[PDB]
Design a binder for this molecule. Structure first.
Ligand SMILES: CNc1ncnc2ccsc12
Length: 164
């Protein structure tokens, strides 16, 4: 069903994640972690304090798809086990040192062809598939893009609902 999903998405904030590789999204799906550059780290730390839910919607560059979406369950932290990211060119471990804990809500893919009717008022009304890493997605466009994903029946949102 979609009832607990809508409950999670109520008054949430949505951020677009553009990973440069599939490997790190894979790693993020396994370990429930994500790291971004300092500029977006600050943005997500600020958003986590400000909304009942901060939703990250993932898309690997040049895949033509979103790969799922997840909920921030913490602010970033530095000093844990060095998460073996496939560092992208121009990025160092120090830059990606801030680690957000996340609870996945859907690990299923959604092809861009299916979100062509959705545009983002915070990105000049461009199709929601278009945007840099960190682009915030406006409440209604974000909500509807999430509802477009196939249900991920392996996930039980009771766990995520209580942290709210
Ligand atoms: C784990 N962090 C990342 N992995 C792959 N691509 C990007 C782009 C900005 S952060 C990031």
């Amino acid at each position: 069903g979609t009832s607990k999903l809508k409950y999670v998405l109520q008054d949430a904030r949505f951020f677009l994640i553009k990973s440069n590789n599939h490997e790190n999204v894979s790693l993020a799906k396994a370990k429930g972690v994500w790291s971004t550059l300092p500029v977006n780290e600050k943005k997500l730390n600020l958003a986590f304090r400000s909304a009942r839910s901060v939703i990250l919607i993932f898309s690997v560059r040049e895949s033509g798809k979103f790969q799922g979406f997840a909920r921030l369950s913490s602010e970033s932290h530095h000093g844990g086990s060095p998460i073996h990211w496939v560092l992208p060119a121009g990025m160092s471990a120090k830059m990606l040192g801030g680690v957000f804990k996340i609870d996945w809500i859907c690990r299923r893919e959604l092809p861009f062809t299916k979100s062509a009717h959705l545009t983002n008022p915070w990105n000049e009304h461009k199709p929601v598939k278009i945007g840099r890493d960190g682009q915030e997605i406006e409440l209604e466009c974000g909500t509807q893009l999430c509802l477009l994903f196939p249900p991920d029946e392996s996930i039980d949102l009771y766990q995520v609902i209580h942290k709210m």
